[PDB]
Amino acid sequence: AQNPNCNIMIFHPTKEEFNDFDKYIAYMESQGAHRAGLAKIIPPKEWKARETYDNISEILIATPLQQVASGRAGVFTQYHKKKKAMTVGEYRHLANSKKYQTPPHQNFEDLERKYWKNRIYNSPIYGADISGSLFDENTKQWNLGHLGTIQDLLEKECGVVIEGVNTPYLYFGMWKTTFAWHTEDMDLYSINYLHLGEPKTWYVVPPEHGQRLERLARELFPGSSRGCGAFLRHKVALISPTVLKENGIPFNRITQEAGEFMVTFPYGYHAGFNHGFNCAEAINFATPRWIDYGKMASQCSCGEARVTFSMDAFVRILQPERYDLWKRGQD
Ligand SMILES: O=C(O)CNC(=O)C(=O)O
Ligand SMILES: [Mg+2]
Ligand code: NI
Ligand SMILES: [Zn+2]
């Protein structure tokens, strides 16, 4: 069995290997990469996403989210308070202000310590989930706006044509902006490219151990767990590495830098934080190996998780017994 300890693997494809996305995902899996839940892909030196980032300041963040925490430093939830719209140039200035800027630090480990110690005492503002793309249309390799769609994959695998579309999202971050513990909608893959700026630290639980994380989460968030049998779908709970180690939960960590891709694999729980002003682009995707995960994915039906148009068909076709209850949650 490849990668039996479920370590995060890092890949350095050549320019020839970077041509065929599906084939390279399948290669990574042949080497055991999925067992970690997360892999890093460093593009060949010949490649670029676009020519420059000098002209992005006028992109609008229509609904910046202030991430307010509740709890204790290692075990907290966050809620998202909506703020007034601002441009990416306005948000960059905000991120660099004395109130929000990254503190002085020695290295990524010192910054990680500072994050876990102090996150809860601040409310950073995240420009998340903005439909759009920063890939040049002429970038032919690993262009996250030109991937095969999940609807087309389901059709290729299962023969059923469905409605829906699949487009990427931009994330503009600052110090301490946080992504809560989650798997993707319908336990899909995700791919995330860090276009510019400061790093993003990730934590991940191997898919084979995801239920251990869920059982901890039910213990640590007992009211939330009573409210919803899949409350990590709400994407609000944080648990620190120290707490995970104290409870024996298997996980790994890695820091993504600008110019690097990360891939999350079906049912790989992940969480993390941004080091400073940055911009990432991410999208979900599927492969043949996903289908069995999609059929078994948990679902939130309490009404909180509220998701995209295109999840309807995935539930309807892969999970027809759950469909009626899930759809009640959506309405
Ligand atoms: O970058 C972020 O805030 C969150 N991204 C992801 O969870 C992802 O790419 O799957
Ligand atoms: Mg612009
Ligand atoms: Ni994710
Ligand atoms: Zn719920």
Side-chain angles (χ1 to χ4, degrees), residues 1-47 49-50 52-81 83-214 216-244 246-305 307-327 329-330:
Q2 296 269 225
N3 192 23
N5 282 358
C6 302
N7 296 314
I8 299 166
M9 299 177 72
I10 303 163
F11 293 88
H12 286 86
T14 62
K15 63 189 194 303
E16 299 77 16
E17 289 173 337
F18 219 49
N19 287 315
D20 185 338
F21 182 88
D22 288 356
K23 176 179 192 179
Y24 200 77
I25 303 302
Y27 171 71
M28 292 158 60
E29 297 183 354
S30 78
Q31 304 303 295
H34 59 292
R35 296 192 61 181
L38 183 65
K40 179 179 290 193
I41 308 93
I42 291 173
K45 71 189 182 294
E46 300 89 355
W47 178 97
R50 65 176 303 111
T52 78
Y53 294 87
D54 294 335
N55 309 112
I56 68 170
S57 303
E58 315 309 305
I59 294 169
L60 194 69
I61 309 171
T63 310
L65 304 172
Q66 179 169 52
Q67 302 189 293
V68 180
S70 300
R72 61 180 176 104
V75 179
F76 64 90
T77 60
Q78 60 186 10
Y79 86 87
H80 290 173
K81 183 177 174 175
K83 309 291 283 185
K84 293 201 161 144
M86 78 182 70
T87 65
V88 164
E90 289 164 338
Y91 178 84
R92 179 174 63 232
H93 191 258
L94 185 68
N96 294 335
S97 69
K98 286 190 193 172
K99 179 170 182 69
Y100 291 109
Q101 70 182 207
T102 318
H105 63 282
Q106 296 292 351
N107 51 45
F108 292 169
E109 179 169 355
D110 187 26
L111 195 69
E112 180 183 40
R113 184 194 61 71
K114 288 176 186 294
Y115 173 83
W116 298 102
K117 185 180 162 54
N118 299 316
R119 160 70 183 95
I120 65 167
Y121 302 111
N122 298 86
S123 298
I125 296 166
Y126 207 174
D129 292 318
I130 298 162
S131 293
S133 184
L134 290 174
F135 286 88
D136 186 316
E137 75 181 3
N138 297 317
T139 297
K140 293 322 179 193
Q141 301 168 316
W142 292 54
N143 182 323
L144 298 191
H146 297 171
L147 303 181
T149 69
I150 299 158
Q151 300 74 21
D152 284 344
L153 180 285
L154 180 156
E155 180 189 326
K156 287 186 301 188
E157 294 299 299
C158 299
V160 59
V161 183
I162 55 169
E163 72 290 353
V165 295
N166 176 204
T167 56
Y169 294 85
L170 303 179
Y171 302 81
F172 290 95
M174 68 169 63
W175 170 233
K176 285 171 175 174
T177 53
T178 302
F179 51 110
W181 281 105
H182 70 283
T183 63
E184 304 304 308
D185 288 348
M186 219 72 186
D187 297 343
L188 282 160
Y189 295 72
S190 65
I191 179 164
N192 181 304
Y193 182 68
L194 191 50
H195 281 281
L196 66 94
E198 305 314 308
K200 186 188 293 289
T201 291
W202 302 68
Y203 305 90
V204 59
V205 174
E208 74 200 62
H209 302 303
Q211 295 86 357
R212 296 182 182 221
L213 183 68
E214 294 175 350
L216 180 64
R218 292 193 303 271
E219 293 164 3
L220 296 180
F221 304 97
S224 294
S225 177
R226 285 185 288 272
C228 179
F231 77 93
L232 294 178
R233 298 284 170 205
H234 308 167
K235 308 191 303 185
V236 301
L238 279 299
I239 306 162
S240 76
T242 293
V243 176
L244 293 179
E246 281 168 350
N247 287 277
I249 308 304
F251 76 92
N252 279 303
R253 76 191 81 192
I254 193 170
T255 301
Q256 176 190 23
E257 300 188 76
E260 306 179 338
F261 290 89
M262 305 299 296
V263 166
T264 81
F265 293 86
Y267 199 61
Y269 274 102
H270 54 284
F273 64 89
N274 294 307
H275 292 209
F277 171 71
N278 62 18
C279 173
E281 179 168 344
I283 198 176
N284 299 115
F285 72 90
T287 70
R289 195 175 68 78
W290 167 71
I291 294 282
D292 286 347
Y293 288 85
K295 291 177 179 166
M296 293 183 308
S298 65
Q299 304 295 0
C300 170
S301 311
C302 76
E304 279 302 305
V307 302
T308 182
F309 177 101
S310 311
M311 237 189 87
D312 193 281
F314 303 156
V315 185
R316 195 167 73 248
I317 300 310
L318 297 181
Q319 309 180 310
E321 187 266 331
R322 288 182 171 173
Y323 183 68
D324 281 0
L325 184 72
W326 171 81
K327 198 167 33 66
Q330 241 50 338

